Write a protein that binds this DNA or RNA. Sequence first.
RNA 1: ACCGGCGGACGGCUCAGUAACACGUCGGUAACCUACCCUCGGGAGGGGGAUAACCCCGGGAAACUGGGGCUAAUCCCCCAUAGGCCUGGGGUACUGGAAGGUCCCCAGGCCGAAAGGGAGCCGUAAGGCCCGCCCGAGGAUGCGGCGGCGGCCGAUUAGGUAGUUGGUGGGGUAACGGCCCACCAAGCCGAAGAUCGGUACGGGCCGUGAGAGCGGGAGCCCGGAGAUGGACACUGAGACACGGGUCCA
Lengths: 93, 123, 242, 124, 110
Amino acid sequence: EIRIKEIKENKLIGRKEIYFEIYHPGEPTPSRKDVKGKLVAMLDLNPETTVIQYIRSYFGSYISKGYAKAYDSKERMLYIEPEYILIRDGLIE
Amino acid sequence: TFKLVISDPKSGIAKQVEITGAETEKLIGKRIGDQIPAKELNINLNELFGKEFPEDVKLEIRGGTDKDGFPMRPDIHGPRRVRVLLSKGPGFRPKEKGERRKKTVRGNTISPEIVQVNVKLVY
Amino acid sequence: ARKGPKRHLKRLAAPTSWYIERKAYKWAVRPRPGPHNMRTSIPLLYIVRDYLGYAKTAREARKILNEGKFLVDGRVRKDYKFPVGIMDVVSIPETGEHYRVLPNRIGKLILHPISEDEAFIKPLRIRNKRMIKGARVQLNFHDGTNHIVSIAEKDNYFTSYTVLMKVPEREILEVLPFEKGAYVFVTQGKNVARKGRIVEIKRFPMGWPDVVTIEDEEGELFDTLKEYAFVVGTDKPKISLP
Amino acid sequence: AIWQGRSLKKPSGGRIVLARKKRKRELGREPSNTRVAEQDKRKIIRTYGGNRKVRLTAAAYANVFDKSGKGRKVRIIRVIENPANRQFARRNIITKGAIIETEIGKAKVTSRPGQDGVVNAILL
Amino acid sequence: MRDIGLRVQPPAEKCDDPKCPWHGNLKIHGRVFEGIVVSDKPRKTVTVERQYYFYLNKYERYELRRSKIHAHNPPCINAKVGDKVLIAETRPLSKTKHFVVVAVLERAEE
RNA sequence: ACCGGCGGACGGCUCAGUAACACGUCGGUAACCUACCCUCGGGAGGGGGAUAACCCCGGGAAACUGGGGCUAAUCCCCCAUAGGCCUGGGGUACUGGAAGGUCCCCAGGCCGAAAGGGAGCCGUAAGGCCCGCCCGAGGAUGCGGCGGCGGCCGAUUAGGUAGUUGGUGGGGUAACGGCCCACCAAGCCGAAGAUCGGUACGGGCCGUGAGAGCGGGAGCCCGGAGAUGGACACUGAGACACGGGUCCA
């Protein structure tokens, strides 16, 4: 289960910032791909234009914070976003 | 036994020859910029370069390098070695603007210790 | 010891007028020389990256500034160390968002959002009067800009007088003089970020500047250096002043 | 090296040892000792901050001014009296305030030929 | 009479020196002080003295401390010993001279 | 790859010395400097020269280095105007309470700018947008300099100082100043501790303590200073210059 607090649009970059919380009481930490496929469903985003950087689960906490970015075109990430979070997300080999 | 680099300005081609024997004594004591007629130099220049040379061809001594590699400088009288703080002139390349390096160079006069000499052709 | 000018500034020694985490990192961007003084302005990168939060990293703030989207008093400035001082108007027309930099009560700079109608007026205090050959008078403003006028109109200007300055095309609009009763906003001192009206002008000899006694909206009387007093209106402020 | 540095003695005569060397900015330069000649010889010197200082070393002409205000470019014959120091007058050395003998007569120099590069004087 | 902006009547007679604030080239700026003349032997020079107390943290009593200052004395005033004098900061005059006398408040006879 | 625009003078390092206007604070330039930055006003015209790369033939275990053939710019130089400076005379307007400075005119003399550019759109082009260059005027970033006060120990260290202290008139400095020079005069400091010696980078601070206080200043920041000891130039806006240069040991 993932529930959102922050949905903020940066129009100078034309990009959407999503701060969300994952409820994982008693089960191992969810992976990048699972939440990546989870948010895109009810936020209705293009998977390739959407990237996640960090998902921090605190000590002794079942609710973990996470931040994702949602771009519009295939060149915005190649220009602005750094090269790591394409590789970590598999967008670049 | 000198290596004489004879350069033709018109053709822009230079050829190396060897001077040995008493011919060597003809070059001892000369300076830089000194002119000398071709005839007594005894080199078959017309036959090396493959082009006719009138009999009034002269050679001017300008440059060269020493046995170790020390070049020539017209500015310094005599043939001796003198360490000089080099701002400009032969035998020194400044890289950083304003550099002055102290280099040891051979004087203008031709000495037996020289192994490479440079001359330029005139007609 | 040091031999020539320096291009570095530790984060710790940054001016106290900045809202910056001092122990976040070792280094901070050195402000290049510009319109204002060091105590009066901030690098634009810290505005973009921290105050607005559009860019998380300095690199993307630099990229956006290179795109030139941000307008500084109606002039694109792609440099990422430009100093933006007091009462400078930062306008981003893509959002239509316009702010004025003003001192806090604590003495740090803060962005007051303003409407569009206020985005083309900048008030400049006349720092000094001089005049150049050809008998052309020149006025040096508090923000380090200079304007030329002719000799005839010289009596319409004096040092410390405020001028409403149409910065988009460099047109003088109005001249607010320095006289008793004028509405005044403080820029420095313990009375910073205050607004009141002038009461008395205390001339001081022996190199000591003049002290102006300012009464607040509620009648509280305090004193402040003449240089620190910025006139903003004849009786009521002509700009939205926190 | 001509050092225009600190006096090495205290006002009370106390000896002072230098805690630091000579910086470049604090060195001086050679006195001009400008001489009278048949031509005008000058040197342009690069200075602190990239500026240029013109220095007249040989002088052959002067601007003699009248009390009214008119100036005349007239030659220099010799030097009459140098109140600054008596050795200069013998050596035809010109400095500020010196008295110079020219075709017009006696003139007092109100210039700094070592810094200005020119010689201006007032007829007396 | 050219104003210096200090509340004092200028000296009556004028002097031709280029170092008189009223009748020269140099100007007055910086700190001002009041002191007493104790030595004036050399040419157009004075050695004014100023007395004051100093507090100490550990013993909380006072400790007299003295300050001798070398101010230039232009001829228009002609300071002497026993005189109370106003002194002002100036441009560097000499190795030790950095001040100038600008007023004589009481003569020696007072 | 060479000229060429910049940086390599900041950032790194240590606490040997240095008892000092070194440093803390306050005034402080009216007696100074300022590349890279911003604002305003103006200019950017004409002409000449230049050598790397490359070609060939060369020295040397070296380091490192020769000649000739040929070439460019925003490389260099020349001419012009502005502009910069100095001096004399005259008359005002501005900064500031002050001073002088700044300004207008006349006179004399000296010195005395530039650079256009890759691409793109339109335009036959021209010209507009982008960037770049110079002069005047500031501001600003830094820097230099002067002063008041604070900041250890020894009396088995009591007189010390000779360019020393001040004045006249000059020099060099970006700049005032004996900083330096010629003359003139005897000043200057000291028992409230000079001089001499010991000791030692100063400060924010740190340890202990109920605190008065005692002790310390390496660890982080600011200021001061130094490249083995010493001495010296050039080039640069900025140096006597850690990975630039020269000399002695």
